[PDB]
Amino acid sequence: ESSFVEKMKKTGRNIIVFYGSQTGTAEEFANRLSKDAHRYGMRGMSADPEEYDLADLSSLPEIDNALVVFCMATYGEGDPTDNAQDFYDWLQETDVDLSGVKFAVFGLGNKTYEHFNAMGKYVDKRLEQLGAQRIFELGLGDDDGNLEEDFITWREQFWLAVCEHFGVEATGEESSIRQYELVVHTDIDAAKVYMGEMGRLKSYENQKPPFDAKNPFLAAVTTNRKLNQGTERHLMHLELDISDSKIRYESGDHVAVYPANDSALVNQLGKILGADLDVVMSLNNLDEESNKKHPFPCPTSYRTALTYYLDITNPPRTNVLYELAQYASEPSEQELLRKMASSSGEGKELYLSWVVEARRHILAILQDCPSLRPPIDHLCELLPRLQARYYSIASSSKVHPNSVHICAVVVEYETKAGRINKGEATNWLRAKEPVRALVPMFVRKSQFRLPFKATTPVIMVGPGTGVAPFIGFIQERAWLRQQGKEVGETLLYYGCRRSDEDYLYREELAQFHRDGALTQLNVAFSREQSHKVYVQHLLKQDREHLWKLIEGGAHIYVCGDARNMARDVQNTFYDIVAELGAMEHAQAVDYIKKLMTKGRYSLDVWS
Template sequence: MAPLSSVDDFVDLVKRNTLASVLCALVGFPLACFVLPIAAPLALVYYVLVQQNMVPSPLALQRQSAAKAAETKVEEEGKKAGSDTTPASGVKTESEGKAKAGASVVGKVAQRPQVESSVEGGRPLTGGVALLRRMREQKAAQAKRDNPDKKILVAYASQTGTAHEIAKVVHAQIAESCGSAKIPVLAAFNDVDIDTLRADKFPLVAFVAASTGDGDPPDNTASFYAKMLRKSDDEFKGVKYTCLGLGDSNYTRFMAVPRNMRKKFQSLGAENIYWDAEADEVDGLEETVDKWTEGAVKAVLKEYNALTNRSGGNVEAKGGKDSGFLGLPALLPRRVQFTWLSAKEGEGVKKGLRFSRDHVDGRGSYGPLAPYFAKVKSVKRVTPADYEKQIIHMELCLEGSNISYKPGDAFGVLPENSADLVGKILSYLGEDGSKCFTTSEQLNSIQTPCSIKDALSLHCDLTSPPKKTLLRMLAESCGEEKEKASLLEMISTAGKERYRKEILEGQPNLLDIFQAYPSCKPHAEDLIEFLPALAPREYSVSSASQVHTGEMHFAFSVVEYETVKGRVRHGVATTWLSKLAEEVEQGKTVRIPIFMRPSKEFQHPESISKPIIMIGPGTGVSPFRGFSHYRSFLQSRSKQDVGESWLFYGCRDRTKDFLYEEDFTELHEKSLLNHYEIAFSREQAEKVYVQHKMQDHQEKLGKLILEKEAYVFVCGDGLHMAKDVHKKLEDILCTSDAAMTPSSAKSYLQDMQKGGRYVRDIWS
């Protein structure tokens, strides 16, 4: 603006500005009053919609119209190509293939949703409304792809981890083959809401199931199993499944859980889509597991794709195509992120802080994540120090723990790996064991922050023969190509025989693998994530709380054996416990982390009026010490008739490994244990076992079972003893006055089992 130099200049300026002001008021006032209040919110709404991708931005609209023009061009070119290259004879030729490719382009363009011609209620939607509708549909379709309604369930029933490991591989292969980690869901059965097993949620289920105890469901499946058995009608209708059963044919109830689950799946309307395989420990699991895994992944994907109109899923393409080895197990992706703490941050993380050693639960309920640290009150060595095997009796103090138990219950112990083995692994890896980490999610039972040494000592299984998925990770960690190739070959289809010999028979631990493949240097976090969890070990209680107040007793035999390769192996938990026993003998205070595993079936009957027959050689006699003391306690308080009690016990030699001799002799002398039969297997040339002692009393036993409705309890080795005893019971029923046929004896025993009158607690 020019400077004012006179009064005239000023008057002139006022006149001009008044005119401008009037003009502004005439145009601006209605604009401000009517147009802006409408336009501004509209503009704001449009801006928000663009930001939310609900409507396209002007730039996107411009791109769309360019794309449409390009597609129209492709359509025209496609039509042209089709008419140019399709031979009149219709013979399939290379050029016909090209023509078909052109036709499919045409088809695709023709099927594309037409923005301008959507129809709703017979009225075509045009312009922005149709566009908005289309954008919403695309967004919903994308969301569905990212998180589909229908998923594939990969479930496992696993007690010691084998079924879980297999399920992990199946899950990883499905995720890899279908290119989406969101489609398959991996879960233990107890974590599956049984009501979601429907065609609209989990139309496909691949499951791996094992049994424990005497044909019982594993802990991580027991509640699902019970719910499933209660279901009726066709609640699984529309669900398609395949199952891999794991079992051991030495057990009388071979494959009980997988067979029952399959049967129930079918009776609830589920349809089997692939071979229900059964892998038997006796023959080796590998071959069946590999075959089932390969076929099951293909079958499940094929069905899933058909159900959901998906395409793709190339199972053959993976599994080591690049490495040149066929049939490799999937290289499982890392799930957990590790954050390493500085030395200063890790200072507070001391050994022993894995769980609070002072943790006391008001209700006495403890678990693997929060155990009770029971003080070892005393130990007693049953076997002489120089004897080839060691049996130790241990007494724990439960005072103040609020733990209660019944004879027949078991309890879990959280063991530690050998300090020597952990030290050697750490120095091989060149790792500082005190380095601490936290993890992005819970990994097994590791409570973070945790040191590498604690993770390896307390949480990782370092001694079981490595599974193929672990070996795959170890192969990828080899610096030397030759060693990597050797490991990959061993776990590929071609290396089946080598795997059987070197791993299954050789039973190398982790350190043996490192020694055989010295360039294998995995990262500590890979090892911690990929090694199986160190499983708690279970022991039967050998005391009765009514008699041994505030205490819990148990006995164990220290496990030591030689592999076919001549390697001497020591059981992780029993070796650790025997070292603790030495410390107790030296006067040290020792505590061990425990939690109760109450037994549902292996319980002394409530009444003592019926006879009881107890059969338990070796440490299998433990629960019967508890039963017998409990029975004497009940007898001292009750006026009711008391049924006869029989105990069949077996050991090698009365001077070497006679467990609980004093207790049973005393109870027998006081007539609180009526019959006490002992098989000393090595005191004579011919081996004598408990079943032989049963044979000596077969007439009496037959009468007790058939006429007096006696209870029969068996505890101990499931591989031989339990089978032989079962057979003997069948013989007894056949030779009894009832003269049963073998098949009626079998079904009589089955009925006894169902009714809780024949109960077994057996292990391999």
């Protein structure tokens, strides 16, 4: 059906929840809200806006008690997710009267970014401008705090508002219904079983372009080398062969990789569950009208699903804990789990401490709640899909057109729970032996780019792994110089803990400076003295030259830690401009923010 409104009429739904999602979180929130509808006598469905035409919103009044909800995540520079781009474009050009339309929006964002929840804010503002009626205030979910708690708090007030305005009431039947039913495929041909590939069956074996998120290219690991000294931490440089993939990229772009869960974790889950992981099965949607026939590719074995399709490392969200409680035979244990779904009080404190702060993954929860023995098929229905991880490409395609490089630090730490957590993708990449080893990947374009004019100077700030895109930038600027082009100054402000422990690309950067490609190599060693010495300290010391370059039209790039470094660096640039630019601090802020709008102050930061 082309019209979501007609689809709603045909299937008896009065609430439709659209999701703007890239890594599945918004989709899960939409699904959870859609299922809630029944608890109020209403009927809902979640939907991918890209599959429909949002202009049809003006027809919702044809359905009694119609309600439309939007769970939208914000991405690069405050833009919409790819699947919500058409909707965003429609909202920008339309002036249709949406009187009679009733809506609510929950935005997914992260305060460490420059444009916090920009998409949710825009959708909410626009719908009202068009004449639609807001049923409940805009939800501002913040992944830098705890997005789950923001969502459940908003969700509760949301339904109360729905009850008040539409005159409905809760049912109270927390029975919780399964969304999928299990079918064991005892006699299936081996060749018809998914073995970890995404999308089409056999797409990993039979690789045909175009390669993207739904059809990743299996790139061979040609290089995987340790960049630092000591068993302390592990920093590594990988080179992935993309020959014959037709994949294109530019320095500044991101490479996404689909990891495989640790087999030791998968094996232990199978044992504690008392399940034969090699059983091949299928989970089928009880809603025969939904386009989402299964929770992940199937038929497939439990081992395969728990290895390639499901997230078993991230601390579970509250709905998973609430639904599992019914399987805890011990009163105390079943009570602990049930409470964690509370938006406040003891229950919330326990969730944030026992699950989140303690970083307990599903196996840890099953282990620390020994009476919890849920059927493996229901667990597979509850666990979120395993998502790709993004890395800043550390190579220039002008120099390495057939290889995509990665600079990454392995995540590994002890939990207050006495366990050793290992980063999903980094522990997996670390184990990829060069020269056989394949990494399913794809490229995600970014707006982080070297200046159009080679003469334009660049100021690069990237401590730690934030140096990644800049290795590529320098390779390219060096290449331009080798092509006989006039290249402006190229400055790198890099930082590490100690010059003899975690100085990434020491030799390469030194050679680029000796070659003349890297005009300046400014490095801050943070722990080689009593007080911290960071990149911003070096920027402040270089205020005169930096102001000259900025005033001249230089481009600034900041990559790495978004939580504190990005903010501290930005604050230092404000000070440089306020001090030497002949203007007040507030004017300096406006000045730097304006550079961002002009593409002369770019960010590639993360957490």
